[PDB]
Amino acid sequence: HHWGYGKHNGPEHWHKDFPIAKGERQSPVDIDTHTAKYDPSLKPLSVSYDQATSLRILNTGHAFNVEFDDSQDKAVLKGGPLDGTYRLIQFHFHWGSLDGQGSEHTVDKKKYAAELHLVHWNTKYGDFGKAVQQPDGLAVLGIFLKVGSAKPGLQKVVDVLDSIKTKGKSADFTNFDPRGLLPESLDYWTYPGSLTTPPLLECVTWIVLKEPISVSSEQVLKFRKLNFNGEGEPEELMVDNWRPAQPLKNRQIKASFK
Ligand SMILES: [Zn+2]
């Protein structure tokens, strides 16, 4: 059967269809802050989202993706541990059924309520499909969400979820500015990893921001109203769509701050 986050098709079963699940550079991982190495050679991140053009929001059956026009670099990520230009193609979240879980990466074993993933691909490879086949093909910016004060810039996303409740549903979602989802500081940890959902390709340079953003209980509650199922099928609430931490193995996590 198709992979998912249930008891019979969850993360522990993925290796049967995707052997790379037991690979050498799988994600997510636990970030041990005392073992992370401060690297003074790491450059500051350069986030240019002023010309971003959002197009649509889609319920993929595993999460909801906000898609962007990536036919030109209008929204790009550069600098940091990256060499070259990476174009933003989509962002999505992972969340839990309770505020005490939901994030994929953890910090000193601490789990956050959710995790935002801004996915970018290396322009030198021409298209997203080619990029995922390369070790330096993608750059994913990870941002933790803690429950507290509401995040104004996230509300437009929250209000449209009713229209894409079930798998396969999509809605026009134009003029959304992703800058409203970024924390004040851009200090980060970085390590070589993989996509956290099948095909689990090891083509990602992970950039995880140290500063979480705050969202209200009401905002996260609305995420939990989505469905894994398609319309007309038995209702399965979309919650706990996160993969647990994987072995770090032969990898070093570097920090841009000390
Ligand atoms: Zn993700």
Curated annotation (Swiss-Prot):
<keyword id="KW-1003">Cell membrane</keyword>
<dbReference type="GO" id="GO:2001225">
    <property type="term" value="P:regulation of chloride transport"/>
</dbReference>
<dbReference type="InterPro" id="IPR018338">
    <property type="entry name" value="Carbonic_anhydrase_a-class_CS"/>
</dbReference>
<dbReference type="GO" id="GO:0032849">
    <property type="term" value="P:positive regulation of cellular pH reduction"/>
</dbReference>
<feature type="site" description="Fine-tunes the proton-transfer properties of H-64">
    <location>
        <position position="5"/>
    </location>
</feature>
<dbReference type="GO" id="GO:0002009">
    <property type="term" value="P:morphogenesis of an epithelium"/>
</dbReference>
<dbReference type="GO" id="GO:0005886">
    <property type="term" value="C:plasma membrane"/>
</dbReference>
<dbReference type="GO" id="GO:0004089">
    <property type="term" value="F:carbonate dehydratase activity"/>
</dbReference>
<dbReference type="GO" id="GO:0046903">
    <property type="term" value="P:secretion"/>
</dbReference>
<feature type="binding site">
    <location>
        <position position="92"/>
    </location>
    <ligand>
        <name>Zn(2+)</name>
    </ligand>
</feature>
<comment type="function">
    <text>Catalyzes the reversible hydration of carbon dioxide. Can also hydrate cyanamide to urea. Stimulates the chloride-bicarbonate exchange activity of SLC26A6. Essential for bone resorption and osteoclast differentiation. Involved in the regulation of fluid secretion into the anterior chamber of the eye. Contributes to intracellular pH regulation in the duodenal upper villous epithelium during proton-coupled peptide absorption.</text>
</comment>
<feature type="modified residue" description="Phosphoserine">
    <location>
        <position position="163"/>
    </location>
</feature>
<dbReference type="GO" id="GO:0070062">
    <property type="term" value="C:extracellular exosome"/>
</dbReference>
<dbReference type="GO" id="GO:2001150">
    <property type="term" value="P:positive regulation of dipeptide transmembrane transport"/>
</dbReference>
<feature type="binding site">
    <location>
        <position position="117"/>
    </location>
    <ligand>
        <name>Zn(2+)</name>
    </ligand>
</feature>
<feature type="site" description="Fine-tunes the proton-transfer properties of H-64; involved in the binding of some activators, including histamine and L-histidine">
    <location>
        <position position="65"/>
    </location>
</feature>
<comment type="similarity">
    <text>Belongs to the alpha-carbonic anhydrase family.</text>
</comment>
<protein>
    <recommendedName>
        <fullName>Carbonic anhydrase 2</fullName>
        <ecNumber>4.2.1.1</ecNumber>
        <ecNumber>4.2.1.69</ecNumber>
    </recommendedName>
</protein>
<dbReference type="GO" id="GO:0018820">
    <property type="term" value="F:cyanamide hydratase activity"/>
</dbReference>
<dbReference type="GO" id="GO:0005829">
    <property type="term" value="C:cytosol"/>
</dbReference>
<feature type="active site" description="Proton donor/acceptor">
    <location>
        <position position="62"/>
    </location>
</feature>
<keyword id="KW-0862">Zinc</keyword>
<dbReference type="GO" id="GO:0015670">
    <property type="term" value="P:carbon dioxide transport"/>
</dbReference>
<feature type="binding site">
    <location>
        <begin position="196"/>
        <end position="197"/>
    </location>
    <ligand>
        <name>substrate</name>
    </ligand>
</feature>
<dbReference type="GO" id="GO:0004064">
    <property type="term" value="F:arylesterase activity"/>
</dbReference>
<dbReference type="Pfam" id="PF00194">
    <property type="entry name" value="Carb_anhydrase"/>
</dbReference>
<feature type="domain" description="Alpha-carbonic anhydrase">
    <location>
        <begin position="1"/>
        <end position="257"/>
    </location>
</feature>
<dbReference type="GO" id="GO:0038166">
    <property type="term" value="P:angiotensin-activated signaling pathway"/>
</dbReference>
<keyword id="KW-0456">Lyase</keyword>
<dbReference type="GO" id="GO:0032230">
    <property type="term" value="P:positive regulation of synaptic transmission, GABAergic"/>
</dbReference>
<dbReference type="GO" id="GO:0070050">
    <property type="term" value="P:neuron cellular homeostasis"/>
</dbReference>
<dbReference type="GO" id="GO:0045177">
    <property type="term" value="C:apical part of cell"/>
</dbReference>
<dbReference type="GO" id="GO:0044070">
    <property type="term" value="P:regulation of monoatomic anion transport"/>
</dbReference>
<keyword id="KW-0479">Metal-binding</keyword>
<comment type="subunit">
    <text>Interacts with SLC4A4. Interaction with SLC4A7 regulates SLC4A7 transporter activity. Interacts with SLC26A6 isoform 4 (via C-terminus cytoplasmic domain).</text>
</comment>
<feature type="modified residue" description="Phosphoserine">
    <location>
        <position position="170"/>
    </location>
</feature>
<keyword id="KW-0963">Cytoplasm</keyword>
<feature type="site" description="Involved in the binding of some activators, including histamine and L-histidine">
    <location>
        <position position="90"/>
    </location>
</feature>
<feature type="binding site">
    <location>
        <position position="94"/>
    </location>
    <ligand>
        <name>Zn(2+)</name>
    </ligand>
</feature>
<dbReference type="GO" id="GO:0008270">
    <property type="term" value="F:zinc ion binding"/>
</dbReference>
<dbReference type="InterPro" id="IPR036398">
    <property type="entry name" value="CA_dom_sf"/>
</dbReference>
<keyword id="KW-0225">Disease variant</keyword>
